[PDB]
Write an enzyme that holds these catalytic residues in place. Structure first.
Site, short mmCIF file in Angstrom:
data_model
loop_
_atom_site.label_atom_id
_atom_site.label_comp_id
_atom_site.label_asym_id
_atom_site.label_seq_id
_atom_site.Cartn_x
_atom_site.Cartn_y
_atom_site.Cartn_z
N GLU A 190 9.30 -28.02 -15.99
CA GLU A 190 7.91 -28.06 -15.52
C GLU A 190 6.88 -28.01 -16.66
OE1 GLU A 190 6.74 -25.00 -12.72
OE2 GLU A 190 4.70 -25.83 -12.57
N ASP A 208 12.50 -24.95 -13.55
CA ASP A 208 11.24 -24.42 -13.04
C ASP A 208 11.31 -22.97 -13.47
OD1 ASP A 208 8.94 -23.69 -11.69
OD2 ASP A 208 9.47 -24.73 -9.87
N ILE A 212 9.21 -20.39 -13.62
CA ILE A 212 8.62 -19.53 -12.59
C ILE A 212 8.18 -20.49 -11.47
CG2 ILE A 212 6.80 -17.87 -11.90
CD1 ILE A 212 6.64 -17.01 -14.98
N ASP A 213 8.92 -20.49 -10.35
CA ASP A 213 8.56 -21.22 -9.14
C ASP A 213 7.82 -20.19 -8.31
OD1 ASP A 213 8.53 -23.48 -7.37
OD2 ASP A 213 10.03 -22.46 -6.14
N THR A 248 4.13 -19.48 -9.33
CA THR A 248 3.19 -18.88 -10.32
C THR A 248 2.01 -18.15 -9.65
OG1 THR A 248 3.85 -20.46 -12.00
CG2 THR A 248 1.79 -19.31 -12.40
N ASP A 304 11.16 -28.28 -8.58
CA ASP A 304 10.94 -27.41 -7.43
C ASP A 304 12.12 -27.49 -6.47
OD1 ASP A 304 8.28 -26.44 -8.06
OD2 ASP A 304 7.47 -28.37 -7.42
MG LIG Z 1 6.93 -23.22 -11.87
MG LIG Z 2 7.84 -24.71 -8.81
MG LIG Z 3 3.28 -24.51 -11.79
#
Ligand SMILES: [Mg+2]
Ligand SMILES: [Mg+2]
Ligand SMILES: [Mg+2]
Ligand SMILES: [Mg+2]
Ligand SMILES: [Mg+2]
Ligand SMILES: [Mg+2]
Lengths: 274, 274
Positions: B68, B88, B90-91, B93, B218
């Site tokens: 990401e 990802d 931190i999915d 945030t 994601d």
């Molecule tokens: Mg993320």
């Molecule tokens: Mg994400």
């Molecule tokens: Mg983001």
């Protein structure tokens, strides 16, 4: 002092109710509808309420009781200054039926029409939320504190779409979400239970919760948990909070609560005391 | 089993990333915006991605990497048959910045442009979700199975409002929710993370998930978790699932997935490979 023994007993009952819920989750359920096709009830909701109401009546016979499923059975709500237990046996019946992991037992206790204590047991995740006037708010021994965010532009809100499938109510619910999203705000979340959504405001995980169409039993438990965490309760108009009004803004601050109130178009609703 | 040692290493890294996230949660954050005022990033997202990318490059130097924050920094996505790690860091945030308890690390692993394994670590609740082709889907060792509900009228859906604050997009997002609520369905939930929403479908807690505007990172982790739990991935049109299309329907069955697809108005989006 005279109510602490009531609170201690209510926690024991909430745990017995959580065991009943978790046991029914292992088995097949017969799902019934109430006011709409999305307003569900099971024999578990009825069995949990019967256990809670019988247990409190035996220990505190002079006290009053208001329960979601008792009202569904035809009992008329007459709210007084009397010591009153406001029970939601399963808050999140839709979640319960689906095994969506947020299902609560909500026990609210009122004296002089003011919240004294509240128990919200999120039984699948085993999170015991408690609040008592002037005694603080806790989740499994951890003292709770609301967030410091007063700016709506940096706010995270919790709400629900509701059980109503009436076109005009659904239109107003969605329009209010659109107005809030357009401010803009950081976002909207929905775990599927009014009590747990309010407890997320109490922990500081969300900045505010708002809903119209919920009932006294949905908010009596969590209400005192929010205020004891440093939060505020308000009507969607900006007026003083009314437990029987079917409306609430549970927020970290007056500033944010008043700001949300300016964006909300009211849904016409029959009061819990009418 | 060369992909099993990769999967074992990916779990260890996801746990290290989880620790960095939980530590950053204890401190104050400097919040930055990306594509919109609701599209957030912190130094933690960047530091977690740098740790993940460095750790995989050291152990598997011949492997490909898509992340990401690397794409946000200007690295162009060229999807090949090569063993590829799709990250990802931190999915969720927005959830992370707010301390809303659903924050995940998502690691997807693809070989021959096909999902091999997937790790989704919901680090605040300490729930490790895993999936591997022909090996099943698990959450903290518990084997996962999608729900049996093919009737949309008895369905519980998960979705997100999205990071866009553009009026037309927000209108389409809300108009799709209204169409689904009006079928009627049992309800809509939003925990604030694509990967965790997809994992709730895999556990059978929700019947389906749908979203437009999300990215390959994601869904690469949670995608194989849904299919290994017995579920299906489809495009929002009803067409074949495309990881780079920015659209998904993650469901318990083709029947439900096709039914949801009939209700969705598409939002124009730039692909992850364009
Ligand atoms: Mg993320
Ligand atoms: Mg994400
Ligand atoms: Mg983001
Ligand atoms: Mg209930
Ligand atoms: Mg309720
Ligand atoms: Mg109910």
């Amino acid at each position: 002092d005279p109510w602490q023994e009531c609170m201690d007993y209510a926690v024991i009952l909430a745990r017995q109710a959580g065991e009943m819920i978790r046991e029914a989750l292992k088995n097949e359920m017969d799902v019934m509808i109430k006011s709409s096709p999305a307003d569900l009830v099971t024999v578990t909701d009825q069995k949990v309420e019967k256990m809670l109401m019988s247990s409190i009546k035996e220990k505190y016979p002079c006290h009053s009781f208001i329960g979601e499923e008792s009202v569904a059975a035809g009992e008329k709500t007459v709210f007084t200054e009397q010591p009153t237990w406001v029970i939601d046996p399963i808050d999140g019946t839709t979640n319960f039926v689906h095994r969506f992991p947020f299902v609560a037992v909500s026990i609210g206790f009122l004296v002089n029409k003011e919240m004294e204590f509240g128990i919200v047991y999120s039984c699948v995740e085993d999170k015991m939320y408690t609040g008592r006037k002037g005694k603080g708010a806790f989740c499994n021994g951890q003292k709770l504190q609301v967030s410091q965010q007063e700016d709506i532009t940096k706010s995270l809100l919790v709400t629900e779409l509701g059980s109503s499938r009436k076109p005009e109510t659904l239109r107003i619910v969605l329009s209010n979400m659109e107005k809030l999203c357009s401010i803009p705000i950081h976002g909207i979340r929905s775990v599927g239970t009014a009590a747990v959504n309010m407890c997320l405001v109490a922990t500081g995980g969300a900045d505010a919760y708002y809903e119209m169409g919920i009932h006294c039993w949905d908010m009596a438990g969590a209400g005192i948990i929010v205020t004891e965490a440093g939060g505020v309760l308000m009507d969607v108009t900006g007026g003083p909070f009314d437990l029987m009004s079917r409306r609430i803004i549970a927020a970290n601050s007056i500033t944010l609560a008043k700001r949300i109130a300016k964006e909300i178009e009211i849904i016409p609703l029959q009061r819990d005391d009418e």
